[model samples]
Target: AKLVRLPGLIDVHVHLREPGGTHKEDFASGTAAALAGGITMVCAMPNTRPPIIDAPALALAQKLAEAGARCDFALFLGASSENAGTLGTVAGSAAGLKLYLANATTNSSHGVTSVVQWMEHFETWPSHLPIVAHAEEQTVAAVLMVAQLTQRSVHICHVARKEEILLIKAAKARGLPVTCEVAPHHLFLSHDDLERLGPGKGEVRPELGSRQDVEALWENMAVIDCFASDHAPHTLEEKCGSRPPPGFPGLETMLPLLLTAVSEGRLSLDDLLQRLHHNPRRIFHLPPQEDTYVEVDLEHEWTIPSHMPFSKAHWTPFEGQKVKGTVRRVVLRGEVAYIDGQVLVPPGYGQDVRKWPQGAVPQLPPSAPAA
Candidate 1:
């Protein structure tokens, strides 16, 4: 079969686990896993141990990502009640802003607890990028309220319920500047799989919705904006322990599953690429790349291994799942960065998206490079 070339994909939601929690996943392991999945650029979340809530925190995380990343990367500046006005100094340096709305399950202890705090950050956030939120069903109302009042766009992260997406669809019809993403885990598997995943393995934020909720997402595809992985990773030890963390290893598994969906006719290839590539760049305002694309062996089929090859968090919730379209090679910034499961670029080779110089716009827009 002939090889198919597609523009590198982009992941707008991922947790690289550096600065703190490198034991679970760091820039190197995370981005390498990203490349294996045909991603060229990743927008990382900021809920690490010390948390990336300020300039110093973002700088430290950027430094760590710069030193260890193997693909293009951008770091998010997490929101908090204290940093409403304080983050202006680093606005130009961040990928975007992330807000957690009082959800203890995976708040990292920095979640925004009140409407006043939400409004404070909403008002002060830079106009260049949309503010992404981790708010669930009812909390989404409060978040959209602030976005409307401030007249700024809000990107809802990992939206998993029927009510949530329907409400977002309603907001968009009303002319609210709102966009949202759904994780692969939520789309491919639901609470039903939790029983099979067993014990702490199925743990994830915005906990898996019912099967009907999963179908509702498919039913309302027109309203969804991006197809993010929400690639949160946690070690098996931590997951199987007395208290398990809410997350899953995802950077490596996203593409095959999506391609499988395409093969199954759940969505067309254009629909998949639009959400994974075009829509994310347009929504996030990312810079362009030169000579970047991924070669996919669309005819290949494989099962997700019990252990992921690159991420330090070795196990996956999608283990034993069969998938299609294995990634064959990735070209980033005109360089062959990954092929045959190996990352060819050295550490620190990845550019910070904020610093990408003006260059030839590829056949497609900015997207994936494996982290």
Candidate 2:
């Protein structure tokens, strides 16, 4: 049994769907899904029922996570025009701030629609916290400009277009405090898949673009800062219904699929480590746990099942896909979280990521790719 070990993966973009929308996923199932995927840590998005707009809302979400989280968790504080006054109060307490450019997904009707309003919020935000943006292609340039004006770091989420990639590359070249992530769906599937899936199944925020755009992402992977599943989950019923919500579960498939990409030479293992492990920690300022690692059998091959065992949504777009590497075990802080397809750690084992032990943070190995 040939095996390879990597630092436990960290996913910075996941929507756990708790504090409301528990039918899709909650902390218990969501973090369990994380463990199964070899993700030891996850940053949960705050697009829940009420949306995490204030201190109390964030407090409630943290309480819920403490009750049920199966792996380390960090929560992103949601930003909207009305919540501008609340930014300072939550900035130091949360993982980062998430900015929505338009009402593309979730309860983002409160999102800043005009550049003036966006700038108002940006001006109010504390410079210390990173801004995680869900801006569309139309708003990408303006968002970067705002970051420059504020002179703050910004992390762009799920970048899917060639123009967006070019913009990020140039921004990084100019020494702008910028980082970005690409979702596996955007990397592997395109508008062609959308057409094939049809109707609600194909729907997603920042809708999938042309095949040329997908290839451009691969060609310019160097500027792409990281990989995120953007693991948004919605039930099958919701997906097939008339008013189907965009997004499907992905936490359980991200690592396996990416590992297969490495085995196929589509990406280098060092690149995967940089994106999935090292860079997330560096960019987010997350303290790496020294003893956490995932063991995988690189020679193993498996077909992805249609029904996900760990997520409440239980379905993935990558269903029936063949992948070459399989996670055999996952260890978190010297404790076994998963082994041989069984979850070993129970809920409440996860720590609030804000309080991660700073001194124990691991050094990036020489083989890890440079960011």
Candidate 3:
């Protein structure tokens, strides 16, 4: 009955699929999935039905989250060629400005296709709100160029390749305002698993990399800034269909899988907390949650189930794997929001972390910028 108490975790990259793909997931199920996994806050992506590219669209997403979300949350404003100039008006409500280079993945057609388009948004985005880019390979270099020229911080999402990460590492060494995250899929699985899963099952953006790529990520873990699940969900049916979309439902599996890694001595608890708790709070400029923590059964062992209990998407790529550690309870602001297997806090219990306690985002040094 060994138990470990930890701070409520924050996952910075998750797609709740609301205002559009509720059949796969929505604020209700997604936030519940967050709690089930010991996460208290999730910064959701903006690639919904209408795409959260402007004020009106952001407002709509805000309303839906306000009504249905069960954990603290914030929404990113998608960077589009048309929305850059006008987005500042609503930047306060956004988690960050997400720039997409090369139509990376699901609903990413709204992403910038040209360097000129990328620079326009990069230069115009408010300094306080960070820019998170779904860029890969040479596009990663392109993003660094914009960040260097503009002297603005940028956070790279899912750096799965050795070359891309080394490039980002070099950018960091040069004192550029840059940071990056690696998804669990990239860290724990690889091309080997991709071939094993096949078709839509293994599909993901910034797709899985080589065995060497996975080792490079572990070897260069110090260069990494955060751990995000990129919890994009699609129905099991869609995954088996001929044209399965790319993405994975990971909000529920992230912590447990990491705990298993910790058990295996891959990384220490301090490393986990730094990336999952402290760094996410600092880089995102998220407001502090009051009296929040998670209780885990550190010795608990379980097999990853094919059907997710909380996530509507139901299936997972990590299915059948055995893992140590399980979330037993989560306390949000002194309230027992989740215990055992039940989500005690109902829909709408979650608040926008940015606006929580009203204007309490502590300012970080501009050198680092909240990325």
Per-residue lDDT of candidate 1, residues 264-360 (tens digit): 8999989988898999888877776779999988888889989879888889989889997888999998899999878898889887887665311
Task: Give the Cα lDDT of each candidate.
Answer: 0.86, 0.85, 0.88
All candidates: TM-score: 0.94, 0.93, 0.95
Where model 1 places Cα greater than 4 Å from the true spot, the runs are 105-111, 357-371
Candidate 2 local lDDT, 245-356, one digit each (tens): 8786788989888988898899999999999989998887787776999999888888988877999987788777898988899999899999877888888888887865
Better of 1 and 2 by lDDT: 1
lDDT at residue 187 of model 1 (Cα atoms): 91
lDDT of 3 by residue, 130-170 (tens): 88998878889988888878878889999999998899888
Tell me how many clashing residue pairs each candidate has.
13, 0, 0
**What is the full ranking by TM-score, best candidate first?**
3, 1, 2
Candidates sorted on lDDT, descending: 3, 1, 2
When summed lDDT is taken over every stretch of 10 residues in candidate 1, the lowest stretch is: 357-366
